[PDB]
Symmetry: D2
Subunit: 386 residues, 4 copies
């Protein structure tokens, strides 16, 4: 009956179930949640852990004694429930000081502050046991062309991430960074708008091994991209350090629907890929129960994230294990896709008349790929209609 348990490694941000329902056009529809109560409620649903921005756990501007008490209460909730904290992050987007960015603000003093605020929370993240430190630069970008020279902004972005790498190395921490792309919202265009742009940027950092990506289902879908394809490219690069699961209906504002809502078939192929690849990180949900809901609906929406992942995991495993699917995959030459093109080497390929001079293009063109029969087997498995 698709019941999650902590061994399934499902995690949730405090800001997800704790979202009060404020949007562009609307006031809060739910009261604030104490993080203690969200840890207890999430544990009762079978979650493994929780994640936080600095300012979700400790109100911005807290004194040291207030900070200590917020952390003490949260630690007690973690210890009472067995919940973990595998990931933490910094809020470099809510406060008005970040209206033009944190790490790429035009004001230099704001960039230095953003770094100090991040470093303070990396120390806390390590104390709470986090292995991954996410960075979503939601304010890095522009609404107009003259406001932001992107080459200078990328120079500032590299300096900031290099300084954070130097800091973790200096402290001997075993935490790694996961950069979260998004194409737009709240900025008109956000820097590092997709998984590809973030992977490319990481290759230019001083210590690329310290950084990966934290892709989000709905973010890549806001650019109309195929989320499973982008996760495959991140896995191919060895850079899937964390993932954010939710639902999105295409090219709109970021909806943050529960996982399995939005593009259902993309959710199926995502689960198939994570499970086939043996991804071992948390399955983290960055979602918002809709503001129509009361607290009972918040917990139902959170439970539905995990249930949908487990249903899709069963159907993807049955698809890949079905001998009729295995035969269809060979009929569609998925086995040949996995064989090297020319392990015989360049000169052998140049000398091979079967590759050019004596290649029958028309007989190869006539061979159907059989992809529709394979896809309807996938449909039938997903719908339980075999």
């Amino acid at each position: 009956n698709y019941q999650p348990t902590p061994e399934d490694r499902f995690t949730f941000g405090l800001w997800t179930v704790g979202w009060q329902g404020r949007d562009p056009f609307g006031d809060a529809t739910r009261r604030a949640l104490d993080p203690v109560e969200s840890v207890r409620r999430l544990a009762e649903l079978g979650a493994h852990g929780v994640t936080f921005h600095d300012d979700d756990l400790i109100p911005f501007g807290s004194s040291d004694s207030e900070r200590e008490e917020h952390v003490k209460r949260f630690r007690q909730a973690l210890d009472d429930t067995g919940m973990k904290v595998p990931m933490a992050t910094t809020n470099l987007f809510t406060h008005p000081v970040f209206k033009d960015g944190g790490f790429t603000a035009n004001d230099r003093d704001v960039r230095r502050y953003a770094l100090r605020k991040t470093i303070r929370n990396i120390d806390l993240a390590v104390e709470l046991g986090a292995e991954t430190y996410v960075a979503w630069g939601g304010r890095e970008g522009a609404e107009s062309g003259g406001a932001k020279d992107v080459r200078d902004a990328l120079d500032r972005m590299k300096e900031a991430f290099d300084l954070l790498g130097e800091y973790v190395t200096s402290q001997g921490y075993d935490i790694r960074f996961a950069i979260e792309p998004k194409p737009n919202e709240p900025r008109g265009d956000i820097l590092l708008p997709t998984v590809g742009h973030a992977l490319a940027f990481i290759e230019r950092l001083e210590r690329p091994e310290l950084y990966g990506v934290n892709p989000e289902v709905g973010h890549e879908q806001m650019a109309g991209l195929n989320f499973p394809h982008g996760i495959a490219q991140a896995l191919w690069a060895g850079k899937l350090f964390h993932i954010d699961l939710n639902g999105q209906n295409g090219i709109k504002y970021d909806q943050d629907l529960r996982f399995g809502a939005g593009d259902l078939r993309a959710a199926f192929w995502l689960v198939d890929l994570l499970e086939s690849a043996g991804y071992s990180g948390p399955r983290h949900f960055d979602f918002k129960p809709p503001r129509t809901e009361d607290f009972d609906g918040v917990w139902a929406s959170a439970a539905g994230c995990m249930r949908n992942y487990l249903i899709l995991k069963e159907r993807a495993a049955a698809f890949r294990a079905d001998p009729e699917v295995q035969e269809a995959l060979r009929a569609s030459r998925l086995d040949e896709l996995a064989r090297p093109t020319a392990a015989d080497g360049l000169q052998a390929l140049l000398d091979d008349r079967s590759a050019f001079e004596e290649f029958d293009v028309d007989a190869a063109a006539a061979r159907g790929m059989a992809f529709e029969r394979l896809d309807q087997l996938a449909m039938d498995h997903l719908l339980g209609a075999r």
Copy 2:
């Protein structure tokens, strides 16, 4: 009066002005053009050069004597006009044999053929003087999730590009590759869908220095991305080896409108960036005169590509040179964006109380960015309303 001359380095594909007007739903509206006549017509408009797919210059399936005569006539047109050939590419998308891809076809024999067809045309490209060899993998991708394992496809894609690098190195050629991303069309999703994905992929090739990107205005806009921002990231990476200029209205089929049509302000900021950065490659137009047009409209549409680039070049230069704009850029702290965040180093930043303990977040938050006044100066310059 914005008259282009060959010194402006404007280039056009044979397939652009030569497009006969066939689309998803329509037969040709114009007769085929002899490449000789397109070289002559383009030279008369002030173009610098032309580009080609193999199969635009030599019909697919030509004998050696037919091939020699097509090349001889084209060379004579180039010599009669002074036109150059700075770029060439392979057609790995029209023939039905490429229905599942060239370099990432599931059929191995098709992948080997795609490589041999590419290598034959690299030799011709070098004979005609091309410095850049573009690769647009328009058939690499899928319409369904089971049809294409993307990690295996990227392994095949890397093998293919590595073999092409080994080939050019083996021959001592001074040609470089430019990979052209596109998010979709004709495949439901195309592999390497954006500039970021292509830049990331190149970093994993055996000899990354041989490869850059060939971004196209309309391709990045089909994902709703900011094309000038993506060009800035490619320039930041040192990888803008070629560029395709055209117009697109957002998230649709690839419209291939003349340059300056589609998103006009994005065309302005693109020209501003290419000119500020001192980009020295061809300004290449990959566009289609609409099928409503006769040949006079084809040449008017081609002339309009160049005219719009030259108008936008004048207005962007006037914007950057205007002392009132220079003052607005300082008021918006574009100068501070270009200064290192912490050249004093990590420990100095950690010890700097002005970056945290004594940073007045509210006074920094209250300082307006003045971006709207700067953007209306940019508007006024673009519209000639100063």
Copy 3:
């Protein structure tokens, strides 16, 4: 096992299974199909009938004796199989003469020709028993703003549809028209781009009762719209005279995937609505088997259209019949949505202090809508995970 039979009223266009695979960037991948063979193959799959454009049944430019023989052979196939022809339409988009439109071409002679070509095929449609005559104005529109004055084009569009109404009335035919909106492709923008625009236009025709809409799943999705919502508005207006079923992944070129592919949950809610509303027209598929496929894949893709509709019909019926869903719908106040707001009348509402002066906004705001629990019951029914 979800086996369709003719009683299910599934229909297919000749151009669907008969699509040879030519696209923007590619030559045909399959040979042409004789309409006789498509009628036989579709009947064997359990289809009810077929539909046609004039030029799919009779090649454009046929002599009268050729026309008679094409019609005779097609009639024999219909009689051999028991297949019906419930709908026909005109091709006013392929021939180059329609490059600027049929009914709204700027050239008046082309508009008059488009009307004569339509009227000739209305007579044939009636002879073959069609009840619905579709009109998809795929060439009505523009790529540039000066090319098409839209108020004048709508005047021409109304004249054309009014003349077609006068013609059918004059002949005593019992056929009705169904106008098919599309937002773009092949024109940069198409006139009557959505269901709403077409419904609005029909209200201004001389005899609106003769006209309804023929919405297509993928067309409304090319504008990012909710297809079930648009079908609900057409049903509310009494104007769903025909429907085109297929799949689409959001905002791209028109993919024409088999029904159930693309947005699966939207396919579920569409079937739920058509079945709840008692829609009695054909379930018509306007799709294209992908060009990767051979003929066996064409028939598998066609069979999959019908199978997916039948699976979704079973799951939507089980959802609506489940007493736990019925209780959830009452908890979410779907029953109250169906009750008049103020059957007591305006003055009673004005005098009702419970509607204003004594309405407790905070107690009403606090009541959760319970929509997430209702939606996860819908998910569980769709996936067979109850």
Copy 4:
């Protein structure tokens, strides 16, 4: 120098310049503005008037004496400046009670409250001289398919608008309604998502003459539609009762950029159409100065809305008056588009062999439309490059 004066009829909502900068992810960046100060500032810029939601002028929950004082101060500002109030509207979206809608909330008590809150503000609107009463149902819609039966919601929506028509008629008011479509945001899908859907809905009201549309540039662009085309359809229907001007970059969250930003060429063709059609309503700006700005940037952004409209008005008038453009419009057969197709009548068309039997399709197909030369004249006029 493009200086607006009140005779230009530019109007602004209090909520536009008064937007404090709160978004999905961010706190306010500017202090609240007193409506008195916004009226004074807008008048100094040359605006004609202002518009309001009920709750922008009178805080929600005000006592009668507070209400009277807010209205008294606002009236004094209007009288001090000569500013008008041509339009008002109701806020049926911010308060949590409207989380599922106002007029189509599933809770009947909320629907009755939404009507009473609207009617109270219609009385105030009439006292302040408004001729148009806008209704943007931003909360009407859903995030999930079971939550909202759209046929029942449209029944509730018609009841509500019919009751409002009965109310204005009963009071003898000369105010008319303008329904504002939007496709999504804040709801996952909003009911009446485009101009077409709203026009269609109005035709089913009891007294359609009382209702028109209030289209917004950015709303239609959030569906990827052509805003000038949609305004042309509203003008063709006689239903453009008000218009909201702003900028948007395609398919994203609603950006509300100043008018002229976003799609510049669409802004040009919009101004060309409003001015050619002799639209006589207010040119209203529904925009948000970006939250990066301080108050000086708010007023610069507001001034830029008006400046851009006046620049585009000059360039569109010069385009239409240029004898070379007039010749190009005849070469493109825009004159023939405006002539009836068959004023000779149906039987004459049927008997006309020049329309079918003797129509030379190939000679008509060969005639180019000359649209690219016409569009580059439009480009040159817009850019001041003639």
